[model samples]
Target: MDIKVHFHDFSHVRIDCEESTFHELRDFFSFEADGYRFNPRFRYGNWDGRIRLLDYNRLLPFGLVGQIKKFCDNFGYKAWIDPQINEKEELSRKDFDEWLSKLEIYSGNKRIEPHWYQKDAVFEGLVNRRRILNLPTSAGRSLIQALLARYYLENYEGKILIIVPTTALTTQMADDFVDYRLFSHAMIKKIGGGASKDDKYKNDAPVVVGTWQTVVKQPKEWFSQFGMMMNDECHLATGKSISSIISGLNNCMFKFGLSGSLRDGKANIMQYVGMFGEIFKP
Candidate 1:
């Protein structure tokens, strides 16, 4: 039987196929959740330890399409994706280098160039649109993020939201952006750590940096204003806060996560991938 994948939104995809195929796909994507066997619910036979990536009714994260396509190929099933979601233009290294040459990044008074890996990371982000970037310490994570924000601001119409882990990071990241000469002080809005919640937050700013704790408090409508979302220190993204915030930002097409290392475990890893897309090690 032919398998068809339809993108329901930026975050989800629905698979149309035979019941047996659906079961196989579900099993293919499922994993034994960490520590689930120790849970009282599981002991009571009230819950299973498995974490199924494919939800009931054949729904899965749009980010998992790559895995699903591979599965289809291996199992001898014909899989088709809606062209609208599958139409991604190929980006060449030359094009990436050309785009990088035009950008001006600074630190204090000195101008700086992005490292080759940093450039490659940004290129992958652009090519994939959504990704979890496993960038190590001293990789100039902030610089890469600033470049992405600057590129999106120049080419896109919506606001960019950078979600950090703490209030200190909100201000620090904003300062870094300005220090890089990418964004002026007045252009960056820093929120979190009980910052003022005023109409200014809703104002027209090309970039807004805030803590996940604060952003998770905002309503779905608030998230709709951002065209791009970047999660800094994504290893901290463990609980409902980040998940809820990511899901609410249904309109955000570009989701990127930066982390030094991901938590160990399949369930935890999938949680990040489900929200931010696949991982790209730089």
Candidate 2:
């Protein structure tokens, strides 16, 4: 049977087709827990256990806009995806470079230069307002955030916050933002630890960096003031708390998640899927 995939809202893919089509998304694993051998068509089988049943017609969710073709091909079905965008319209590379040049760059990287794919990661991040950047290690994850911070700060009057898991991480990212020269040339607060002992952690600064432990504790009023947010080390999204953040927990216009290692987990995976679009692998 053929598949009809429709684009919904910012980044949701609705597979309007047979229940068996969803079944085909899984595999009949050859092993199981409780000392048994059985195969179940589970959409997710991370552990050595019986697969969990998935909703048949789930409206779950991409940037390339053209990559969904393989999803239908693998299932031996033809795909009829709605053409939501103009075929002739496209973002010019020249304009992209002009937007890119505004971002502050450290001198060392210019000497070594970046791999072609790395450059694409930076560009794609700019064009897409919401995305989970699957920027694997050695791919310059922080640099992506730096450019993003620069973009929001330059383009708007919004306050930016970067969330890290550890205080040490808070320090590193704060330094990177300063070294990279974010617009407003504002101070980047390294929050966490006893940062709350002093109000330095809470600020109206143009840019700020803090551990999730401390930043999340701020009053709900505080989160509302934030115009932009950055989730450092996005692999941490595997946790329910981190994924529960963003749309449900706080209010912000734009967000960018940078992760080195993207792993598997059902509940958390959907959290990532729901908050941002599918992982934007470079």
Candidate 3:
């Protein structure tokens, strides 16, 4: 049996299983069309089995890159992807010594001390502006957010919004960012219950932390103020509230996500990686 993979003119994967495993390949996974097109009335959009076979080669859509990568990974097939897709969720070092050194101002906070890899993660987001960063639970992801917050406040001058899954985490991060010696407590806005005060949250303070439950209900104009977005425990982003949060962030220039796990087996992870940016892991 022979397997060949390459990008074709139609912008889909041309998979040729020379001896012909394609018909069998087409049977492996089922397909469902998007909601609006789910009815049988439409030919292309209606729900049906996805027959990738065209003549002999199976034509796979770009949305299935995640699946294609895995199949190629397992079967020793040579694969090529669009140049932009070549990186595949990889976060790399762009501007090093100079940019990393700028973070030295954060040295005011003793808790601000970070291992080299942590700084790499921060700088990666700083340079890329929009990213999905995967830091293990033990990795102290809050510290990374605080550093970015401090960096933007000091250097670029932009409002920061931190969206988390729960009020507890929101208060915890608010307290940590304020009390941990990272930045001025007066400049921080801790919203939601348990040590949260909707008061003194200056639009000028440059930092705001809120739970998705609260933030999602907020008006669209509310989301437009921030220059940065830090979504915590981001794997949970598929939730209704989180999806709303992702949707309403119109004016934010720097969007970043911190996740302990990116194992969600959905195309949205790839979509998010495209929208929010790459995942940099240590």
Candidate 4:
């Protein structure tokens, strides 16, 4: 009996199965009688009641599905398989204009400027190495500092939760913003060491900074009050705990991931374009 296998990507494959050759196909696909089964969608009639061989990809190793399952389990969300496609729904020009307006307001009226490395050779060298350099000249430092300040000012409001990696860096970020008077309408509060529950629960305060461990260990009730979430040093997005907190949040809309080095060697650049709507390179 001949079986037809269709390749989708390195990770997924589709196989066409026939009723007559079902038993033979199960053995070929390495289905054990006692093995746990997962029928993605309730379609095939014969395999409806029992565990059957699923022809996802013959190329992948034996336990690949289990690894994928484990990842999904850790995040508390299932990987969407063969999701329903809806092409008719689209944003109109008017809707787009409104979103743009909100984004401008969110970005603190700052336009996406061209990240020109040519302006300063020293700055360009540091950016290549993913290092933060404090320029001796006030003009250069002030320009970039103001840009970052505008980002926090425009994007955050009303019970904001900021998760950073360390306490020292948090203090530094807070100090820099305070020195520049860049807090906008928001009151920035550090909720790490020596912080009280009363301080974090203040309804009037707009921004709150805490370490990742602090936020993770906070009561579920505390996490529910936040209006927006910002993850500084977002290279840690791959973690299960971080994903869990994000999924549990209520009023989070404007998500920003700040990173100097987010690229991984094995990543496919094209996949990001598809994932993130479109790539805007200036």
Candidate 5:
């Protein structure tokens, strides 16, 4: 049967199909959760390690649309995107470089330029829009994210959210953005820990940096106001609260993740992929 996947929004797609085809998709996307053997439920013989990627309602991460098409092809079943869903805009390297050249990047008192690899990482992140950037330690993940936030803010409407694992990282990211002069320190709203949870935290800042521990408490409506989001140290994205926050950003158009390494496991890796597409090593 020919299956059509319709875009509900930037975050999810819905497959309109019969129950049999839905089951096929469900099984095709299932994986065994890592370390599930030790779970009390599993030991009690009431559960298995199986984790299904497809939601029971036939919804899937928009990032996994490519894989689903491939799955349909492999099974001799036809599948395609609904015509009304427009593809993401393409960003050329020349345009990206031109924009970066104008920005006076800096670290401390030294004026600097993005390294060749850093440029490559930024270019890939911009081009893909939704991807996990597997950069090494001291790869200047903050600089890359700053560039991305600036570009996205320049080109798109709505606020950008940057979620880190800790409050220290939240302030650190805000300071990094300040150093780069991407936005005024006042304009770059920092939430969590040292930051006061006041009206400013809820203000219309062009960019917001927050710790997952804090931002996880916000309702889905709060996240709806953001059009782009970045997950730093995304190796931690598989955590319960982080997963819920990432999944709840239904209106977010660009979802970029930066991580030193993904936690070792297929289930954990797929959770990241489901939220931010495939991993791009630069």
Candidate 6:
């Protein structure tokens, strides 16, 4: 039996045949369908078999029109699928520059100059205790700590809570902040220790630091008033209690996840770019 095969616009492949040949084509279609489904664009129903077999360039125009429609709809703007030539407005160079500047300021990293990839490796080494055993430098520590402090100050009115993995690190981090004079108005309160007034302990401190186990047992509303949360050693992002503390924060704006090792087993460079909005290689 003879079979007729149709290639439509480099997208859809159609087969026409007799009963015997159609059986063979059925198996082939199943394999071809798998390939078609591989493209994420085809997962959506919009572009399936819509383009004509002739005029291959029409796909580009179709895609561009779809993109414009999507952009307008996402931003809640008026969309014109088929607008007149004169209706199109051109952006001036100055206007484009201003817009670009604003976008850069919002998304750009004004922190350390080291490559993120290199930093990731460094962080991993530090966590594994292969590189420097000492804690991060004052400048490096304060860059992240100060960002968290300011984040709490601006968003939560200085009501901040930090849930660390252990009491030792909790005390260390609090001392580091005090030593560096980062956020002087913020006080560090430790729970569990039965220290008296003469022991120099205060709960009215702006920032309260405690172990995850201790903090998790506190009333949910205790954390709800916190405006910021800094997850030290965020490799424990999958923990149930950590997630609970994170979710309970009412005014959480600045979530700084500090870890020497920031690795996602399932993600590669491309996935990191999607999550972080930028890619850094060093």
Off by over 4 Å in 3: 1-112, 198-201
Model 2 score (lDDT) = 0.57
Residue 222 alpha-carbon offset, candidate 4, angstroms: 2.8
Predict model 5's lDDT versus the native: 0.79
TM-scores of all predicted structures? 0.86, 0.61, 0.62, 0.42, 0.89, 0.43
lDDT of 4 by residue, 1-282 (tens): 144444333222344445544344344333222222454333444454332333333332111222333433543433433221111123344543353344322123444431343124222221221122222232333234333334434544535566666877556555554554455323667777734334445446566676777677776557665644555555544333543364345344233334444544423221221111111111
Question: Model 6, stretches more than 4 Å misplaced?
Answer: 1-139, 154-158, 183-186, 192-201, 266-282
Residue-level lDDT of model 2, residues 54-84, one tens digit each, is 2244444323234445556665678677665
Best-fitting candidate, scored by TM-score: 5
Residue 45, candidate 6: alpha-carbon lDDT = 60
Worst 10 residues of 6 by lDDT: 271-280
Report RMSD (Å) for each prediction in the order shown.
2.9, 7.1, 8.9, 14.2, 2.6, 17.9
Q: Model 3 misses residue 246 by how many Å? A: 3.5
5 or 6: which has the higher lDDT?
5
Model 4, 27: alpha-carbon shift in Å?
A: 22
Off by over 4 Å in 4: 1-157, 184-186, 194-203, 263-282
lDDT, candidates in the order shown = 0.79, 0.57, 0.62, 0.40, 0.79, 0.40
In candidate 3, position 227 carries an lDDT of 73
RMSD, candidate 5, Å:
2.6
lDDT of 4 at 110: 49
- For model 2 the TM-score comes to 0.61
Candidate 6 displacement at residue 6 in angstroms: 46
Which sections of candidate 5 miss by over 4 Å? 34-49, 83-86, 196-202
Task: Identify the superior model by TM-score, candidate 1 or candidate 2.
Answer: 1
